[PDB]
Swiss-Prot record, chain A:
Keyword Nucleus attached: yes
Domain remarks in the Swiss-Prot or TrEMBL record: Binding to MYC is dependent on a Myc domain essential for oncogenic activity.
Binding site for ATP: G59, P60, P61, G62, T63, G64, K65, T66
Cross-link (Glycyl lysine isopeptide (Lys-Gly) (interchain with G-Cter in SUMO1)): K214
MF terms in GO: ADP binding; ATP binding; ATP hydrolysis activity; ATPase binding; cadherin binding; DNA helicase activity; TBP-class protein binding; TFIID-class transcription factor complex binding
Note: High level of autoantibodies against RUVBL1 are detected in sera of patients with autoimmune diseases such as polymyositis/dermatomyosistis and autoimmune hepatitis.
Family of the protein in this entry: Belongs to the RuvB family.
Record-given protein name: RuvB-like 1
Any GO BP annotation: positive regulation of DNA repair
Keyword Lipoprotein belongs to the record: no
Tissues of expression: Ubiquitously expressed with high expression in heart, skeletal muscle and testis.
UniProtKB/Swiss-Prot annotation, chain C:
Residues of the full protein shown: 917 to 1929 of 3230
Function: Catalytic component of the SRCAP complex which mediates the ATP-dependent exchange of histone H2AZ/H2B dimers for nucleosomal H2A/H2B, leading to transcriptional regulation of selected genes by chromatin remodeling. Acts as a coactivator for CREB-mediated transcription, steroid receptor-mediated transcription, and Notch-mediated transcription.
Family listed: Belongs to the SNF2/RAD54 helicase family. SWR1 subfamily.
Recorded disease: Floating-Harbor syndrome: A rare genetic disorder characterized by proportionate short stature, delayed bone age, delayed speech development, and typical facial features. The face is triangular with deep-set eyes, long eyelashes, bulbous nose, wide columella, short philtrum, and thin lips. Developmental delay, hypotonia, musculoskeletal defects, and behavioral abnormalities: An autosomal dominant disorder characterized by developmental delay, speech delay, mild to severe intellectual disability, hypotonia, musculoskeletal features, and behavioral abnormalities including autistic features. Skeletal anomalies include joint hypermobility, chronic musculoskeletal pain, scoliosis, and pectus defects. Affected individuals also have non-specific and variable dysmorphic facial features.
Signal peptide: none
Name of the featured protein: Helicase SRCAP
Superkingdom of origin: Eukaryota
Compartment list: Nucleus
Curated annotation (Swiss-Prot), chain D:
Role of this protein: Possesses single-stranded DNA-stimulated ATPase and ATP-dependent DNA helicase (5' to 3') activity; hexamerization is thought to be critical for ATP hydrolysis and adjacent subunits in the ring-like structure contribute to the ATPase activity. Component of the NuA4 histone acetyltransferase complex which is involved in transcriptional activation of select genes principally by acetylation of nucleosomal histones H4 and H2A. This modification may both alter nucleosome -DNA interactions and promote interaction of the modified histones with other proteins which positively regulate transcription.
Source species of the chain: Homo sapiens (Human)
Residues annotated to bind ATP: G62, Q63, P64, G65, T66, G67, K68, T69
EC assignment: 3.6.4.12
Tissue specificity: Ubiquitously expressed. Highly expressed in testis and thymus.
EC top class named in words: hydrolase
Compartment(s) of residence: Nucleus matrix; Nucleus, Nucleoplasm; Cytoplasm; Membrane
Name of the protein in question: RuvB-like 2
Name of the coding gene: RUVBL2
UniProtKB/Swiss-Prot annotation, chain H:
Organism, as annotated: Homo sapiens (Human)
Protein name per its UniProtKB record: Vacuolar protein sorting-associated protein 72 homolog
Biological role: Deposition-and-exchange histone chaperone specific for H2AZ1, specifically chaperones H2AZ1 and deposits it into nucleosomes. As component of the SRCAP complex, mediates the ATP-dependent exchange of histone H2AZ1/H2B dimers for nucleosomal H2A/H2B, leading to transcriptional regulation of selected genes by chromatin remodeling.
Description of post-translational modifications: Phosphorylation is enhanced by ZNHIT1 and promotes the interaction of VPS72 with histone H2AZ1.
Top-level taxonomic group: Eukaryota
Cysteines joined through disulfide linkages: none
Subunit structure: Component of the NuA4 histone acetyltransferase complex which contains the catalytic subunit KAT5/TIP60 and the subunits EP400, TRRAP/PAF400, BRD8/SMAP, EPC1, DMAP1/DNMAP1, RUVBL1/TIP49, RUVBL2, ING3, actin, ACTL6A/BAF53A, MORF4L1/MRG15, MORF4L2/MRGX, MRGBP, YEATS4/GAS41 and VPS72/YL1. Component of a NuA4-related complex which contains EP400, TRRAP/PAF400, SRCAP, BRD8/SMAP, EPC1, DMAP1/DNMAP1, RUVBL1/TIP49, RUVBL2, actin, ACTL6A/BAF53A, VPS72 and YEATS4/GAS41. Also part of a multiprotein complex which contains SRCAP and which binds to H2AZ1/H2AZ.
Lineage, highest ranks first: Eukaryota, Metazoa, Chordata, Craniata, Vertebrata
Family: Belongs to the VPS72/YL1 family.
Subcellular location, record wording: Nucleus
Amino acid sequence: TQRIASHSHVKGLGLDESGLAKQAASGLVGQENAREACGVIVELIKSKKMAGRAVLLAGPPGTGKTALALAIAQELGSKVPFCPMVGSEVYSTEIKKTEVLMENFRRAIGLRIKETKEVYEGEVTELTPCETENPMGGYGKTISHVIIGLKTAKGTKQLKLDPSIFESLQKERVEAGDVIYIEANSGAVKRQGRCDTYATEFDLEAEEYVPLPKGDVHKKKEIIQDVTLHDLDVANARPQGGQDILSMMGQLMKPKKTEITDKLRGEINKVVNKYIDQGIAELVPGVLFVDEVHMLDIECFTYLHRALESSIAPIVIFASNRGNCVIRGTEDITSPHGIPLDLLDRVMIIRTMLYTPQEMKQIIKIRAQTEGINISEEALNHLGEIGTKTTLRYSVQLLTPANLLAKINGKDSIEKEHVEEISELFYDAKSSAKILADQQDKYMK
Amino acid sequence: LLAGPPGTGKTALALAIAQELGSKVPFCPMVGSEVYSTEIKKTEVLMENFRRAIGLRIKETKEVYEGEVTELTPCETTISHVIIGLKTAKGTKQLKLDPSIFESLQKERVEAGDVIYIEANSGAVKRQGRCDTYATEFDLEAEEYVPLPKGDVHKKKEIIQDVTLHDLDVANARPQGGQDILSMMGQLMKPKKTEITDKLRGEINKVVNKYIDQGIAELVPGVLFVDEVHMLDIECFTYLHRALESSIAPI
Amino acid sequence: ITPGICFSTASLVLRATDVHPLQRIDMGRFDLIGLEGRVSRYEADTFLPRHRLSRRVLLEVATAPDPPPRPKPVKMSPFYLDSLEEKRKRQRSERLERIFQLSEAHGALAPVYGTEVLDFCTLP
Amino acid sequence: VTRIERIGAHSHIRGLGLDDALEPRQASQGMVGQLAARRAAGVVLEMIREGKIAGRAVLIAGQPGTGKTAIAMGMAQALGPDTPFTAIAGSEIFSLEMSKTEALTQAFRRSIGVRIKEETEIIEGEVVEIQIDRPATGTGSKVGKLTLKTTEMETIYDLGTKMIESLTKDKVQAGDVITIDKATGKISKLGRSFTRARDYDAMGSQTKFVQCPDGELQKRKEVVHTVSLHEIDVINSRTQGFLALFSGDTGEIKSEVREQINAKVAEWREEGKAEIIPGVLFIDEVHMLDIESFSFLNRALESDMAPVLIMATNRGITRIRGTSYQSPHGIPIDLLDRLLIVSTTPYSEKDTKQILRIRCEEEDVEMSEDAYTVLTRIGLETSLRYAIQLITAASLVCRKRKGTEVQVDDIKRVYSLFLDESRSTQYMKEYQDAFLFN
Amino acid sequence: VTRIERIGAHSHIRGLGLDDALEPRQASQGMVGQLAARRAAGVVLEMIREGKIAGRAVLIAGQPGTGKTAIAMGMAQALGPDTPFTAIAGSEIFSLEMSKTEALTQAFRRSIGVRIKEETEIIEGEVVEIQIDRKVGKLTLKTTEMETIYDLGTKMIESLTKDKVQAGDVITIDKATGKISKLGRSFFVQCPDGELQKRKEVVHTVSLHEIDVINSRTQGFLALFSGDTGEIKSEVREQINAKVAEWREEGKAEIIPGVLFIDEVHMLDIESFSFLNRALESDMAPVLIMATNRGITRIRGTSYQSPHGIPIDLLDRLLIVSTTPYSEKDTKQILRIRCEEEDVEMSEDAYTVLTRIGLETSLRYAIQLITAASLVCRKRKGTEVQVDDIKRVYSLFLDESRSTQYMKEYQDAFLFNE
Amino acid sequence: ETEIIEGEVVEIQIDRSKVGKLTLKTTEMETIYDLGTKMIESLTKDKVQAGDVITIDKATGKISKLGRSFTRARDYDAMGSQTKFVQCPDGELQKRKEVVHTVSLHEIDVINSRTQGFLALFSGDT
Amino acid sequence: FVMPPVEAPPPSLHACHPPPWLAPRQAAFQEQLASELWPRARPLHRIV
Amino acid sequence: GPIITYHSVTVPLARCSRTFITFSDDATFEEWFPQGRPPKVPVREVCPVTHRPALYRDPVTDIPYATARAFKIIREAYKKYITAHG
Ligand SMILES: Nc1ncnc2c1ncn2[C@@H]1O[C@H](COP(=O)(O)OP(=O)(O)O)[C@@H](O)[C@H]1O
Ligand SMILES: Nc1ncnc2c1ncn2[C@@H]1O[C@H](COP(=O)(O)OP(=O)(O)O)[C@@H](O)[C@H]1O
Ligand SMILES: Nc1ncnc2c1ncn2[C@@H]1O[C@H](COP(=O)(O)OP(=O)(O)O)[C@@H](O)[C@H]1O
Ligand SMILES: Nc1ncnc2c1ncn2[C@@H]1O[C@H](COP(=O)(O)OP(=O)(O)O)[C@@H](O)[C@H]1O
Ligand SMILES: [Mg+2]
Ligand SMILES: [Mg+2]
């Protein structure tokens, strides 16, 4: 978090309340049409009423596609799930590509569960049965309640409980002076150790003595837990915590992703629907971002057709900087973005354009501000001129070496000489390619 | 590289080099097509052979107490120690054993009249049968009767054994023994070669350097001979570029 | 239900890998993976460098008489042989030297990770 | 609140929309047009419902966007949950855990259901009083008595030791409406007829009550157990198969196990124990199968346990994967002889407009007639799916400007913001050097 | 009764049919003709039995259906069961369990055997009385010549309790191990005659691969039956080779070099051939015999053409035995031998017609037609195969040539013609 | 940073596996401790006896054995592979242990991947 | 309901004069593993 | 025999569920409900030598202490007591 990454300046989409894109806001410069389309897509995500919709960010490299996707993620917030993914990740040695894609799809669909957990804490001060003056059956003594006195830091309360709790109390070996907690939703007593006021400095127990609970005896709170469908699927496919031989085998064996069946996924969907109907949980459909979609092969694209046609799928964002390239896994089949035309028919294409020199200068200034670097106007103009040739990434990547060189030279700002020296020290892609071409005989292969 | 037409003696020259070096220098012969394993990556095979070629010579004196057991009495304070009586052709010796050895003696089912040996440095106990003087105690027992040991009860031998870095790597790749349930279930697992981490390699190098400084170890760099090297692919050659530049690699 | 397969082999085959202890070195001096979960960074770094035994201390303790009995809690030479004794004291010296060498050998190695590091890094 | 299932591509299709004579209506149950293809789908659906002929294969072939998957989803929705419908993609059979033939076999056998119908004795009533007497110390025989009540009965039951243990585990109290199966002794709580005593603390908020059951106490109810052939194979393959039912990881099931299961199911069917419910396997984009998978399909359709197989492909004369042979639809002619082909014709203007109207009704979007005309023109020019996407895009744009009806301006705005394949390809040609490869 | 070993393709081959001077006979031990190939095979057999030269490799090359596998089977038959003869196909070395080099290394080590002799005491008799009391016990055993009472130890008492032994059972006990195997009950197997306790000399021939697998891990012998060997470490193999050398030096064991036969070796790829090139140079390498019918053919895994599909570097280490096509007389003699093997009686005209058919098309086609003609003759209640039956089975069953002609007639009806 | 108790075991008395007392000593100190059920179970599981030099973590109660003290009666002829003789600790019985180590993120991932994931830090079968 | 057509115990390794420590070690390993794991396998009893 | 009776009844408030537990003999009732009195807080012992709160307890002298110097002083005092009283 403290370290500055390449998209550390993107705090969202700089959109007006009417959806129009401001020239420079929220860390984004230019790309007004793409930003407006991404805002429409953000509204679509927030509407939560569409499934399997796909958006493709298409444009030359270094044109803000990943920045736009991260701006979408920032606009949605941490509540909305956002599962980034590169196309190379589908090639796994454990599960098939379709399984990886399905798992990421289920990772993007989130579920938020709201529940109230009511507990009674305290140190047991009193344990007195409530006998009845008329014993049932004539002989012996009958009891109708068990009075438990619970003491905390700022109070003491008595709880008239069901007589059946006597067995749980004996099983937990609860005696006077012990700290216990009783859960309302289950009616069970759990002994979380003994109070520390009865412990001496000469005792050696570690987890036996516990501090007296603070606060009130009756504690209730609302617990909000955010989970994804993939979390439930994996937790049910390879369960952890059992005491049977299968759980022991799972612990022993090397963990391995498995092909989760449609039966388990249907059961999870049914449980989630039941929870939603009960009012416990609220569905939070998020976004799956698949960067470098062109690295997927023809099998992945074909599966993606069925994946997107599903009614449970999230909203998928693709990104490709390829032209009329050959689809991987096929022999001499060319498609406009490296994506077969069948999948391109299922997506909405957002075009990202190249940046004018003014926009490049603005982006350089913003990146310098984010990295804590003061740059002079002449140095900024020289770096923008360097960015007119070469690329924008080269210019934003010369900022920190130049700052280091200035600091070594003893200056708090980047001057033009520092940028010139850095340009002399480091070559760009075009200059290196020219050097290689001029000496193609001396290099290898 | 030995380059020449077929039948010109490249393998013969390598074997002549091996003969000139002697059996004390590790000569590891491999064929280029042996890197295509189905358990580990090709670079792992190459690095395993590299560590195989490097040899380490360790000089150590081992002590073993061997003989027929004439008495086995644990001494209670728990058990402070175990007094054992071992008999050989050259006499009898009474030994006091660390109480941890009592568990090993009980596991091996050692009773009076059994012929055992105990390793002094490790406390390992092996019950190598019953003494043949007791072969007539029953007319039909399913026992293996072994002669009484000939030498002294206490046997000392100073030995020099050569090991390779790969031996230490595979000795530290998986745990041995262990009475836990996971360890026992791991003993049933099929033994598979694994891509040993570079952290483990560096730690083993540190251990080897420590023992060399102590003066109990000597390094024999050795030679790894790769025949039919043209069977290696481009990835193997690229990895060889880095591996040969290491300061730890063999010839 | 079928009877099992009785596979008979030479008794010499089952002893092919077996090596006599006098013919093999102790590989426990290179056992790094066995130390995990048993030896801590404290033992290797702070305790053992400070409280390692010395030959002088070992000899002094061995030669000194038995310690006096612990106090109870209060609520408040005709048959003498010189050669036999020389052999016995040589054996005692050898035993003490072996004890020292084994104690040094069994605590020479430091764990790669240690119990503290593993416990700190192990989430619930 | 939004359920886990939301508005998808085929969310408006509730069935094929046919009449009794399998004559397709122009617009019913979401389906529009494709009259001949829908009639063929209805005939195939009747064949599936009859469930008498095993291993029939149908190929839905047509241009992209002609409603092949729409027709398949309509067939699936018209079948109903009683009949199995396994829908997979062609790419899904390529697995690192099992062979292609094993994956195809599992896909087939997930589409056949085995149903076992048996009658059991069931006790359902309101607990009036339950008493359990147990020894104070040491192992002993617990003695108990339970009282159950309906609207017309009340009986006092003497309880055995195992029923006592079951009741103790279930924590059955007075007022709990419980179900008891006499054979297995299983007890299932289904509610409380009234609240517990108020004087007790730490009890929580009482939920709603359940009315006491009527009729006799010990009734006779029909219990139906339904599993697929794949589930039987998985749970019989190995001890851990029941966990493999959820984790996958079945490996390759032995052919001996499958032969035993086929024989046993045939014996059960002869002995009236179980009924076979053959279903459908839908392989979308069957052109991704290789020559080996097609060859396996050739002989796997010849079994009497095979379901009806429905394939969809939009390929012309194309090279078969794994070979260098050009074949229609990417399928070998030997398999093409074993299947009937259903062609889908392209949609006209009125069919496109009706599809757009149904989609807008499904998405709760109100659109003007001029906007419908413009959107239909766009769909004819670009594609149907592009127009469907622009539907929602224009709905969102209209909602942004605090409107109520989607106008032509919103459609033009979303046409400007989002591009089709043609305009994207044109703009990429304009900047060909900027894009990376070719 | 029908046993597992029925009549196969080489069931009639019982040897090489050579005399003491390695001069082949015209017809002997199921072998007809090919004098040069049989003489070379006899020389290779003498080399194998001598056991002095290690890693010698021989290739049997010739046209299809020229007795290459027949020569190999005769070589295998001339050697006894004592000498290992591992026969695999080239396809078998391609495995998902281990590498190709590992497969060839295990193929090599399966061909070298270690012969170990040891003495054991074996007690075989009929149980008379077994007594166990709370441990002590007595056991009384009898033969047809003597009777004895044994005082039992604890371990033997446990062994006799584990394997239910009652009076009247005839059992054998291995004294050192307690291995009790019940071989029947007598009042069904006759009671043993001679001494009750016999000292026997048991000889085991254990291959190097078997030693490696047994010593690879605990309960590792199971891998000899269920695969699951993985890739055995080279350290274990070197240790086993060293220990076997120690045994040979100390006289505890004898090495029995054997033969590894790889039929259709052209299925091997360049990697396997390169591995074999150096695997043959070890002193523990067996004799390798290979057969292939390929002419100048692409080597698998490469684009190079080689005379046998084998790279020339390996071919420089091979001795090549060439098989020549058979004449009319040799073909007729082979047909007679196969008829005698299958218990089929033919007329001389039937033999002539079948010889002409075999010469015109193939020897294997005629050998196959023999059984079909016998069945056709048995269908019409005949006893001897006539020319009519041979013509009937010729018409019923096609050969490759006529099948190809008929396919070319209707080439459009078939699938994927090129 | 962890508080520990470090000393040589003098006496272990267990009354009847219910309650007991443990006596620990240094070269300058000696004290007796009251044990609970779990402490007694941990002491019996590790087979802690007299003369052993042990450290006890106050927070978790885990006991690791450093060595044992050497006495005239412990002159063993053979020693086990893990036993080693160490001097009785000096100073105070209660001590603070500070451990500083450098690990990588991948190592923590491997540690928390499975139950005994630290073994994969050696084998590499991650 | 599926039963294997054949059922056999695992193959046994026999030698005339085996190392007298192998069998007790294997027996102890099997006994400990059974004593530790059989209680955990009781739920699968009906399946078995 | 000696039994514990668990009883659940339906009683009018219109109806509510109540549970009762009946013990056949008073010995079982006392065993399950000992009615133990609240425990007593131990006295925070203090080192007689340094007056700091006690952290240790010398087994020989049973005198709590909180310093090594305090331990040495206590052992010296015990030795003097042994010498005097004998
Ligand atoms: N319009 C923009 N406004 C602000 N920053 C941008 C803009 N476009 C790109 N960047 C930044 O410049 C860098 C270029 O990367 P990017 O354009 O995201 O690559 P790609 O084009 O492959 O998505 C990124 O770190 C991004 O944060
Ligand atoms: N200079 C030499 N002197 C003696 N023998 C040789 C010589 N060169 C080769 N040979 C023999 O010729 C055979 C083939 O040589 P080889 O080592 O295979 O050459 P290469 O390894 O280059 O193929 C070997 O058995 C070797 O013993
Ligand atoms: N005849 C039709 N009636 C109703 N909706 C249709 C029809 N044809 C296509 N659609 C809808 O158009 C969208 C794309 O059609 P689709 O069936 O995916 O084409 P394909 O046949 O190429 O799969 C789907 O959401 C589908 O619901
Ligand atoms: N010389 C021969 N003597 C006896 N039988 C032969 C002879 N040659 C071939 N056969 C038999 O005829 C058949 C031809 O097979 P074979 O010639 O071994 O094929 P390949 O050419 O692949 O080795 C075999 O069944 C073999 O038994
Ligand atoms: Mg489709
Ligand atoms: Mg052949």
